[PDB]
Design a protein around this nucleic acid. Structure first.
Ligand code: CL
Ligand code: CL
Ligand code: NA
Ligand code: NA
Length: 325
DNA sequence: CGGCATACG
DNA sequence: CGTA
DNA sequence: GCCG
């Protein structure tokens, strides 16, 4: 089992679901405490289990696996022996974890803001509502729409949304295309947001596109909230006899950069962090959603496809369905 | 020990 | 600071 | 927390 998540296929569903979920609780809790190193380790150990071809039933199966040291191994050991890990359960029922999870789930609220509110004694969404002077307009929208945004988006919803985005994009710039990215491109049947990448086949025609797209969607009454080339919005999505708020991200890239933007925005988040870490540390190349830079030659690799990018990094190609690290 | 992805709004 |  |  190779050390980086980008070196192994990771399917969306797998054979170690409970073990990985437990490790991810500890990762999440480390993040709430600002411990990014520990968050990464627990994320990586969880991902290794997702990549295994069968269930871990015995502690000896962890031998030789990367990212399993004393701590992650003890978590697995306790789950195998008793069905539960005392540390994980202590985190789950803790006021700190529950409140930081609740607050960071709000659109517009990150760990730092959540922690500040926690320290001020705030605990519930109604606590935040009672103090609107404490909120940015983005947070106010996140809080008003929190219930809808907590509901899973279905792939059927995604397809209806794509047609609407395509219509606006087509008027903004005929010939421009819309590609579904994010978790849905990785095969998810449900999700909490929808990501689209927009380009045009004629290099440079994409300049200034996103404001034209957003103005048109706003004119159609589809935008509940928006605040350039990336837009993090809340859209009005039809439902039987009503509608609901959905998080939608829109990103524009020049066609020259499209494979890099597609790769970046397809995720998963851990997959992309691992891939960029691999590129820099193992290959000495610097990867982002715009390109892949050789800092010695001072040149950019001109990729025509995601397959090109994997080849240039010396990695076996993984389709989006196997990037669920 | 140092390092942990890398951008844009 | 937030977002991915 | 773990790797190199
Ligand atoms: Cl840490
Ligand atoms: Cl980027
Ligand atoms: Na080990
Ligand atoms: Na948030």
């Amino acid at each position: 089992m190779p050390a980086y998540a980008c070196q192994r296929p990771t399917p969306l569903t797998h054979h170690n679901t409970g073990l990985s979920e437990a490790l991810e609780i500890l990762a999440e809790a480390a993040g709430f405490e600002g411990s990014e190193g520990r968050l990464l380790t627990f994320c990586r150990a969880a991902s290794v289990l997702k990549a295994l071809p069968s269930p871990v039933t015995t502690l000896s199966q962890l031998q030789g696996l990367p990212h399993f040291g004393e701590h992650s191994s003890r978590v697995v050991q306790e789950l195998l022996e008793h069905g539960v890990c005392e540390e994980v359960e202590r985190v789950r029922r803790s006021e700190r974890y529950q409140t930081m999870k609740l607050f960071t789930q709000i659109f517009g609220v990150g760990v730092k803001t959540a922690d500040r509110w926690y320290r001020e004694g705030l605990r519930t969404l109604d606590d935040l509502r009672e103090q609107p002077q404490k909120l940015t307009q983005q947070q106010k929208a996140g809080l008003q729409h929190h219930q809808d945004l907590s509901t899973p988006v279905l792939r059927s919803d995604v397809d209806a949304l794509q047609q609407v985005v395509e219509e606006a994009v087509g008027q903004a710039l005929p010939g421009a295309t819309v590609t579904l990215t994010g978790g849905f491109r990785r095969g998810k049947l449900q999700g909490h947001d929808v990501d689209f990448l927009i380009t045009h086949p004629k290099e440079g025609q994409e300049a200034g596109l996103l404001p034209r797209v957003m103005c048109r969607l706003q004119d159609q009454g589809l935008i509940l909230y928006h605040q350039f080339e990336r837009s993090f919005c809340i859209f009005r999505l039809p439902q039987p006899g009503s509608w609901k708020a959905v998080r939608v991200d829109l990103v524009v890239a020049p066609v020259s950069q499209f494979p890099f933007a597609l790769l970046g925005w397809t995720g998963s988040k851990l997959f992309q962090r691992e891939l960029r870490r691999f590129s820099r540390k193992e290959k000495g190349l610097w990867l982002n959603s715009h390109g892949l830079f050789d800092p010695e030659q001072k040149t950019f690799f001109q990729a025509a496809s995601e397959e090109d990018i994997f080849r240039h990094l010396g990695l076996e190609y993984l389709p989006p369905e196997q990037r669920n690290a």
